[PDB]
Amino acid sequence: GFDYDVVVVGGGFAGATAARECGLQGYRTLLLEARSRLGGRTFTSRFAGQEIEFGGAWVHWLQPHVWAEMQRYGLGVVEDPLTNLDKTLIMYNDGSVESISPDEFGKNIRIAFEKLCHDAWEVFPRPHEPMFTERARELDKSSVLDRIKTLGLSRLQQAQINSYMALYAGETTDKFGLPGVLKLFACGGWNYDAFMDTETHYRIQGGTIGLINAMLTDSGAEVRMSVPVTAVEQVNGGVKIKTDDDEIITAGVVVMTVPLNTYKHIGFTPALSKGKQRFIKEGQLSKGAKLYVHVKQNLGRVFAFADEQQPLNWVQTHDYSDELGTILSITIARKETIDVNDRDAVTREVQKMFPGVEVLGTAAYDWTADPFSLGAWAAYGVGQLSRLKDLQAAEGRILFAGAETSNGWHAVIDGAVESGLRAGREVKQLLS
Numbered sequence: 001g002f003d004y005d006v007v008v009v010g011g012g013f014a015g016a017t018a019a020r021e022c023g024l025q026g027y028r029t030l031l032l033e034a035r036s037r038l039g040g041r042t043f044t045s046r047f048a049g050q051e052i053e054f055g056g057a058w059v060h061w062l063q064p065h066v067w068a069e070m071q072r073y074g075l076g077v078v079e080d081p082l083t084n085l086d087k088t089l090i091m092y093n094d095g096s097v098e099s100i101s102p103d104e105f106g107k108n109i110r111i112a113f114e115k116l117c118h119d120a121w122e123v124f125p126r127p128h129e130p131m132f133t134e135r136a137r138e139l140d141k142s143s144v145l146d147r148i149k150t151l152g153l154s155r156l157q158q159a160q161i162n163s164y165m166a167l168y169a170g171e172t173t174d175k176f177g178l179p180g181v182l183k184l185f186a187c188g189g190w191n192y193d194a195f196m197d198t199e200t201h202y203r204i205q206g207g208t209i210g211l212i213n214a215m216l217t218d219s220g221a222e223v224r225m226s227v228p229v230t231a232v233e234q235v236n237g238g239v240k241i242k243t244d245d246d247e248i249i250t251a252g253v254v255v256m257t258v259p260l261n262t263y264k265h266i267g268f269t270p271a272l273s274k275g276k277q278r279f280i281k282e283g284q285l286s287k288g289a290k291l292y293v294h295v296k297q298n299l300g301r302v303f304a305f306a307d308e309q310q311p312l313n314w315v316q317t318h319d320y321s322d323e324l325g326t327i328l329s330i331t332i333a334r335k336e337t338i339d340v341n342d343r344d345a346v347t348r349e350v351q352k353m354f355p356g357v358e359v360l361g362t363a364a365y366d367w368t369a370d371p372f373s374l375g376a377w378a379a380y381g382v383g384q385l386s387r388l389k390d391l392q393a394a395e396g397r398i399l400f401a402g403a404e405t406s407n408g409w410h411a412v413i414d415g416a417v418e419s420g421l422r423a424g425r426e427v428k429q430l431l432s
């Protein structure tokens with residue numbers, strides 16, 4: 001008799017949902033978390049006196065799985081105001097910064113987006129079966145820049161949507177797969193307004209950590225923190241999991257939910273399938289990071305795009321007041337473009353967009369540097385989505401979940417919740 005029935009690896013949303021599924025089944029469930037905190041690529045902290053989100057935290061009811069979880073646990077929405085900006089700006093790869101006044105900005109970006117996903121519906125009638133139509137399979141041969149070039153856009157709108165998709169790719173759009181973007185838009189209802197409503201509009205009452213804690217308290221599982229898994233060995237119709245302090249924990253099955261980019265630091269015995277190995281060594285493309293700045297001046301509601309060779313690719317105002325000053329929430333698609341390491345560099349680069357600003361405070365998360373994320377959100381490279389199956393397939397008594405392994409909203413929390421549900425299904429399968 002092994003130590004536990006099931007061992008979940010990773011205290012993210014995927015792992016939390018899997019642990020809940022298997023605990024409600026009455027299995028002896030243990031969850032191991034490398035970091036000293038739960039939530040994984042979601043993390044609520046505080047800066048300059050207020051609550052902030054260094055990772056994922058915005059959800060929507062058009063996302064079925066996490067919304068069902070919120071319903072089950074009674075978690076309401078918290079709406080961030082995103083109405084009538086005071087200044088919308090677009091910075092180009094050459095450093096040019098032009099202030100467009102909102103409505104024109106918004107409608108030209110709508111044009112660029114809709115023409116980018118012109119064939120979304122036909123290519124993806126079933127967003128949850130990404131490669132149902134094989135025309136999506138053939139489009140996975142293409143980049144998103146490949147179609148951006150063939151859509152004949154404005155220079156303004158080309159810059160807009162290319163910075164958008166560089167954010168979504170955590171990379172340069174030349175490496176960004178096309179079918180992933182099209183499928184994500186499909187899941188959103190093939191509609192620009194509805195899909196955009198699921199961007200940075202609604203957060204979870206009590207926070208992503210609130211939902212994580214609800215799921216974990218419910219599951220009844222044992223949660224160990226600051227316990228990294230370094231190796232897994234399938235033996236004896238079960239599995240042995242090795243921690244970084246060389247302790248062995250036996251289980252009937254293990255559900256791996258740690259990000260793809262980190263699989264390279266876990267040794268599997270015997271070796272995983274060849275497609276799984278290829279995926280593990282490729283990983284995914286996103287190299288983003290989160291950054292909050294706080295400057296003396298009040299700049300009101302503000303939004304700003306920046307294309308892929310500028311650093312502060314996504315910028316919006318978190319809060320504003322004549323006395324407090326201004327707080328800038330910012331997402332960077334690639335950490336090699338700006339090192340939030342440097343308050344000098346952050347001040348320089350934000351002054352390039354809001355000339356004459358006094359930087360009071362800085363707070364940053366470099367997800368690319370974190371050993372247990374080695375990247376940000378899921379972002380498929382060219383040709384990856386079409387073989388997603390290899391990453392999903394269970395290998396013996398080893399089950400694989402995680403946002404990157406989901407079929408629907410792969411680039412956000414919902415993908416992780418769906419991963420966990422599927423993992424629980426497979427666990428029930430192999431333990432009944």
Ligand SMILES: Cc1cc2nc3c(=O)[nH]c(=O)nc-3n(C[C@H](O)[C@H](O)[C@H](O)COP(=O)(O)OP(=O)(O)OC[C@H]3O[C@@H](n4cnc5c(N)ncnc54)[C@H](O)[C@@H]3O)c2cc1C
Nearest residue numbers: 010012013014034040041056057058229258402403412413
């Ligand atoms: C800046 C940013 C903004 C985002 N915005 C949103 C958003 O607004 N809305 C949204 O829905 N999603 C958003 N996303 C996506 C989102 O936060 C993630 O997709 C989601 O958390 C995926 O969860 P996961 O379980 O699949 O993986 P993770 O949450 O990363 O879970 C992996 C866990 O495994 C652990 N781990 C790794 N290696 C080991 C090991 N060897 N042993 C033990 N444990 C290990 C890690 O510590 C981590 O806790 C955002 C992400 C980022 C980074």
Ligand SMILES: CN1CCC[C@H]1c1cccnc1
Nearest residue numbers: 167168199314331377411412
């Ligand atoms: C949650 N999204 C998934 C793709 C990129 C990420 C995102 C969206 C908006 C602002 N910052 C990050």
